[PDB]
Symmetry: C3
Subunit: 138 residues, 3 copies
């Protein structure tokens, strides 16, 4: 069909907006807050989905950051790689290939974000990529 | 339609299970053995598809590991990046961004896994990502 | 439906061929010039989509290479990661995980290619991955 709007909301009430398409056993879902743009004819700007410490579960093990969500859809997605920028508490930052999934636990959707080791605690993760998940239902 | 079960089998008789959907010129296929889970409310476990030396062709050139398969479907897929853990014979291991495709040769499906150089011979590759391929047929 | 042929053309008249499928709000598009092959039973060859300096806009900021295109389709795609080889003017080269999108500016399609810093100016970028974009329209 045509693309339907939706959103998830984080623990700190951040709204993550998306559009989706739901066919037979298929759900395709794109996050739409950070679609990058050419702002003039020579410059491309990435936009970030910004996720702070307070959006993650504690304790964090093995560079796995879990973002409990409310609302939206309940899918076991595949893993997608993304561009991350991981900001440490001392404001240093590392660009990384991150790996993201949507999973369901206790009937709730969670975003799983895995990245590499950093020399410090993380203040914030920015997803700089446009994320789209193709998912199989049932 | 609804999602149909299938599998490939490796040279050592490892079974790689998947579900798929086949529409007009479109085949979407997800490997389902290693769907990660939140096992309690704070911990996410990745699962691995584990591929050993004996599942690969010899000789291996340019960090390209070829896994001949039997059964399943015959597709020329796009390339997907994945999380790999590459275990060396001396049990050291390296986490890498791997790149995976399905290709067909002599009427047989093969999984192509490319990764980075490692200081040793590889005993095992673990794919820690949930893999889904969207493929164009004909 | 069945897969339709198309192409984009670069500033230097390089033709980038693709096949696509356009359903309701959905456009799936695969670039087809560099489908890798097993050429004998033990060897896999990657093929490259080769993009030179003259195919990019100037000035280049933040390791973002913008390839203005003509013809083809007009989509705001998600970001896909790919295998790049980035060739410097002194012929040294770096293998990287690149991130690619299609975007539209002034009614024209552009391919956005982002990679990592390199110690020199880039002569050429080779995309060694088979690229397929799943896109949401409207
Ligand atoms: C990836 C996956 O399978 N997730 C499932 C989890 C885990 O399987 C449990 O940890 C097993 O106890 O179980 C559910 O019943 C749940 O609690 O919501 C459904 C959910 O989809
Ligand atoms: C990616 C690709 O094109 N693979 C094709 C190969 C190679 O083209 C051959 O190496 C050309 O001789 O050829 C086939 O006939 C084959 O042997 O099964 C079909 C297969 O899909
Ligand atoms: C990602 C995105 O939104 N791109 C859009 C751009 C930018 O929004 C402009 O920079 C805003 O002025 O605007 C268009 O009208 C354009 O010039 O073709 C449509 C295009 O799809």
């Amino acid at each position: 069909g045509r693309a339907t709007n939706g959103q998830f909301v984080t623990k700190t009430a951040k709204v993550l907006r998306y559009k989706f398409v739901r066919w037979d056993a298929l759900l395709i879902i794109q996050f739409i807050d950070n679609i990058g743009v050419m702002e003039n004819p020579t410059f491309y700007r990435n936009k970030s989905i910004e996720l702070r410490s307070a959006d993650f579960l504690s304790p964090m093990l093995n560079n796995t950051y879990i973002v409990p969500l409310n609302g939206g859809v309940r899918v076991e997605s595949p893993t997608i790689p993304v561009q991350l920028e991981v900001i440490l508490e001392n404001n240093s930052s590392f660009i990384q290939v991150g790996f993201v999934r949507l999973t369901v636990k206790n009937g709730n959707p969670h975003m799983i974000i895995q990245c590499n080791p950093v020399p410090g605690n993380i203040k914030m993760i920015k997803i700089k990529s446009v994320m789209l998940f193709t998912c199989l239902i049932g």
